[PDB]
């Protein structure tokens, strides 16, 4: 009856298990290796940065933007109403996950002069061109046409979000610690 049927069943079953046991590691070898997984933290000397200047630094293989904003940059940033944004979340790891995309919520300091963010377009990864580029006085992504304002918020194009802000904090007078 189901004596021999169960066997054939239990057999194919063991097979499937062994098979999967062999397949998973063939897949997992492609996941980040131990040397990669050693995600450090870095320090950036920011003493030579005048306002109107953006510092591009590598971190975890991707660019990080450090702009010392001008008065014009700060004014234009503060003049936008939350409801006028494409994405209202601050995307700032330094504060509450629920925080709002207000310009004050996009800088490291209260004076809002230090804009520090991942120079990684939220659409498909390119690094947006700065120097006050695009239709909103911010950055322009040449890959598919995303425009970001002077606080790094997405205002046009296919990018769904605002450029993320990583853990960052002035460790002292002229030094910022990323990560």
């Amino acid at each position: 009856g189901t004596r021999r049927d169960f066997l054939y069943y239990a057999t194919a079953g063991a097979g499937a298990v062994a098979t999967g046991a062999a397949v998973w590691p063939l897949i997992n070898q492609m996941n980040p290796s131990a040397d990669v997984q050693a995600l450090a933290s870095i320090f950036v000397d920011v003493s030579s940065v005048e306002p109107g200047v953006q510092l591009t630094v590598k971190f975890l293989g991707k660019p990080i933007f450090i702009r010392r904003r001008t008065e014009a940059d700060i004014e234009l940033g503060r003049s936008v109403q939350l409801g006028q944004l494409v994405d209202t979340n601050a995307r700032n790891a330094n504060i509450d996950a629920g925080a709002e995309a207000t310009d004050q919520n996009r800088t490291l300091d209260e004076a809002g002069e230090w804009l520090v963010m991942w120079g990684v377009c939220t659409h498909l990864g390119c690094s947006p061109i700065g120097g006050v580029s695009g239709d909103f006085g911010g950055w322009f992504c040449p890959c598919h046409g995303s425009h970001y304002d002077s606080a790094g918020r997405i205002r046009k194009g296919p990018a769904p979000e605002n450029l993320p802000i990583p853990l960052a904090k002035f460790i002292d007078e002229t030094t910022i610690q990323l990560g």
């Binding site: 040449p142 598919h144 046409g145 296919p158």
Partner: peptide
């Protein structure tokens, strides 16, 4: 890794599908 060319453009045989993709903005 720290800079994307201003005139980045796909390989011609990829252009048509690329065009379809960026036509769809917010």
């Amino acid at each position: 890794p720290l800079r994307t060319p201003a005139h980045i453009v796909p390989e011609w045989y990829f252009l048509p599908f690329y065009a379809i993709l960026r036509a769809f903005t917010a």
